[PDB]
Design a protein around this nucleic acid. Sequence first.
RNA 1: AAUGGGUCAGCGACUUAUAUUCAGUGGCAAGCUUAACCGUAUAGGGUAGGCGUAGCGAAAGCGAGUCUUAAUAGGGCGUU
RNA 2: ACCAAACCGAUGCAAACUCCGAAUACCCAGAAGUGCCGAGCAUGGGAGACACACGGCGGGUGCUAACGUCCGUCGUGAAAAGGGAAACAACCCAGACCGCCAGCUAAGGUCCCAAAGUUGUGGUUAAGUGGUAAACGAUGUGGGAAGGCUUAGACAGCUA
RNA 3: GGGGCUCAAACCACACACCGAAGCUGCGGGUGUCACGUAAGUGACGCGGUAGAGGAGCGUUCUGUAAGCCUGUGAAGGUG
RNA 4: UCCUAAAGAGUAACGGAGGAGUACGAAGGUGCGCUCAGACCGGUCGGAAAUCGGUCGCAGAGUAUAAAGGCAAAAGCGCGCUUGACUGCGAGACAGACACGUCGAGCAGGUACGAAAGUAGGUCUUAGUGAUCCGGUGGUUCUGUAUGGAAGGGCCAUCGCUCAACGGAUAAAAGGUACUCCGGGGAUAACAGGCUGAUACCGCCCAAGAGUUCAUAUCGACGGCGGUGUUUGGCACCUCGAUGUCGGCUCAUCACAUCCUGGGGCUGAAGCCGGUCCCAAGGGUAUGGCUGUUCGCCAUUUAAAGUGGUACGCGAGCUGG
RNA 5: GCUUGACGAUCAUAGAGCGUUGGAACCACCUGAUCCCUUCCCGAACUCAGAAGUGAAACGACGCAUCGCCGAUGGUAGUGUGGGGUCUCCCCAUGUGAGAGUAGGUCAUCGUCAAGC
Lengths: 76, 57
Amino acid sequence: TRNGRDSESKRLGVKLFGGQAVKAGNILVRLRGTKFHAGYGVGLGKDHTLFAKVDGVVKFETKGAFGRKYVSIVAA
Amino acid sequence: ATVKVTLVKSLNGRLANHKACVKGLGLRRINHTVEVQDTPENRGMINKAYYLLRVEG
RNA sequence: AAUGGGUCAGCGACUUAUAUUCAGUGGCAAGCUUAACCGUAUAGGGUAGGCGUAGCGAAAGCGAGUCUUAAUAGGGCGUU
RNA sequence: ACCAAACCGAUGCAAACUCCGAAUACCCAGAAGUGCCGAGCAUGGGAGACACACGGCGGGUGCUAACGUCCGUCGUGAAAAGGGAAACAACCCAGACCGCCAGCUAAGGUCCCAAAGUUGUGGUUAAGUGGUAAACGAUGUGGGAAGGCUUAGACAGCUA
RNA sequence: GGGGCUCAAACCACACACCGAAGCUGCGGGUGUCACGUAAGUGACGCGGUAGAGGAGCGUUCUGUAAGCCUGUGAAGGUG
RNA sequence: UCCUAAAGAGUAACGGAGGAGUACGAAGGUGCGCUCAGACCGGUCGGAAAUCGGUCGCAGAGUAUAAAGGCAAAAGCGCGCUUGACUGCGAGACAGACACGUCGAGCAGGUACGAAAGUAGGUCUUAGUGAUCCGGUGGUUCUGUAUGGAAGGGCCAUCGCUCAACGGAUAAAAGGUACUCCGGGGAUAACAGGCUGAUACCGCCCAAGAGUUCAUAUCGACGGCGGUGUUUGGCACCUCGAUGUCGGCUCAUCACAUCCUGGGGCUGAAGCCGGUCCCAAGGGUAUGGCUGUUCGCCAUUUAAAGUGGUACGCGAGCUGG
RNA sequence: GCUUGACGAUCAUAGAGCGUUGGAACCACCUGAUCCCUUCCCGAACUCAGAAGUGAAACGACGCAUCGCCGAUGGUAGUGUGGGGUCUCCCCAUGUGAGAGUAGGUCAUCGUCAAGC
């Protein structure tokens, strides 16, 4: 019945938007279960964190079947 | 190729963006007139702060 | 229509000591500086000690390196 | 002759619904000019603050009550005088370096207190409405669209 | 807000003129910063402010300067 | 975990909803394989239902657990092997006051599976937790107060327990004050004032109805719109370097929503009476028994014993029940 | 220059449905399971050896817009900024601008390699 109780608001979402230069370890998307999928040179960590495996710029392409949003890094 | 603007209203309660536009045109106080080049990026600051200015040409 | 003061004239509130840090300003400079104390005594002497000239490591230690490490790999701190 | 999930069609609604989906704001890159000569960053020396208020907008709570209260975001006051709103932190205009018996303006104003139009053209309004206000009620009056009843003689009033 | 206002001194339009601020401009001063300048030397942008930071001064008493200088031809104080 | 949250983050309330203080040696790893659920129609124990044969199917199933977000390379499901639920680290980011926290390519050493590319530093993801100081235990290259050892200490790994007020005052922590005291505060309650009007009070709009007929002579259900600040509230704006209660007495003053007296209209007003509604504020408008009473109930009067505002008028005017 | 395979680009204007058509090469179905291998029980999947038959199933190509899915223009709602009002809401200037629906589309378009014509 009685009612308080929130939690500490985990700061999720898109870091490193769609034209930005990335280094080879940077967190792309903090994610709660794959909104965005792992593209060309990006990694998919344990808690579905997208991180960069190479350098370049972020792409954010909507590719393929299943309508999936991909974060990929184009070496440019 | 050159447009002249006159600041005819005050800055004293304006949004910080609009008064940044007026400052970026080179205007310092009321009835002050500059001659600025008519680049499209000067006309953006003229158009954002349109209500404070007097844009003759 | 909150406090305080009737008024005047006197008085009445960031000090001092010792350690230290930063700035400014001087002296000496890979060195600088003395404390007690001695002193015909603000001089001169007294360099014990303090800080600097090297760091790393919890330490032994090793040292322009050192620690961790199975590692001459990585990484931390350091080095005209 | 009771009652009937479900599908078919029509019809709505949500902060904890979404097949959709902005404006903005946010992040990055490249550019002109402006910056009061800087703005940003970094390292140090000294702080103060860590009870905010009200207004506009976007919300929760309340009774879409309170000069209630909790958030977001702008603005002002705090810590800002001046002019306007009669008087009136926070509303409008505008940010006071000093002097002037000079001028032009902003908000707001121009019959007299009181500075400036008893200004001009065309209207509306008779309540002192302006200069306090709701459901609803009124041949109040101005305007603009439309219907049929409209001289074979209509709408209320005299000679079967 | 009051007097008072009714072809308005109210309302809805439109026009032209005026008043109105410590706003702007003119004229005369002072100040900060920056850039220039054999350092006269001008320019340009500034200059509301509480807590608070920073900068530069006045005055009082004492000591040195000072066995100086002033002062009974008149000190300090007091009052114009 | 969702909303509030304003389409990046973040964001409050004694705001709205739910959860956690764990499980698991497989519910982990890997290789290989496989899709769920639902209607249908099928009566000789179940009859809508179990076991299957799936035609349509068309993610609605499942996921250890709340919610949200994700899942075909399924992250769901089955089987075979198995320990990577490794050691040393760690480029670089996310988060962020700090302490904490989150993700992680790659390199070395050794291993799982797989023919091999490769995957594997636990689990679909985010909760499942606790600092330091004390102690305990196992190592150790270190130290080891003359020396050789020990003792004790250090580093490395680990346990406790209790800090659930969960950034943890101490190993160890209940009350009374009307006998009270001090320092502050109108940062904050009681009185009265102030903002509001839920509530209260007074009017009005429609009129089902009753009034023997007839809605409007009188009421008037269901609903609606307001006025006044009249009183119970809500707020905490003034007052805590003091604005001293309720009632009575004494003295009042205004309003009008009029109790009497005055003037009317309608009537379901024959007349005496009335009912209701307008207009009117000039003057009047009880004494007592009870109780501290305001009020109230009675008794007896009057033409009538009005309703309210004034710090619920009035204690530098009295009383003090 | 087309047909059949394999692999991709792209994920419905590419789908689903309905109809016609394909066998010689290819692929599918097919024959049999001695032998590899397999069935929480399999030669119906997985696997091997095939070459008698069939294009029925499946798959492919061509048709059709009824279904699904795309989808204008215009308007409307929202909304940044500035100003108003009778301010729990709208209006004006200016910039922007949907979702839905309407007209209309769509029975895909590409590339590499290999056999055939």
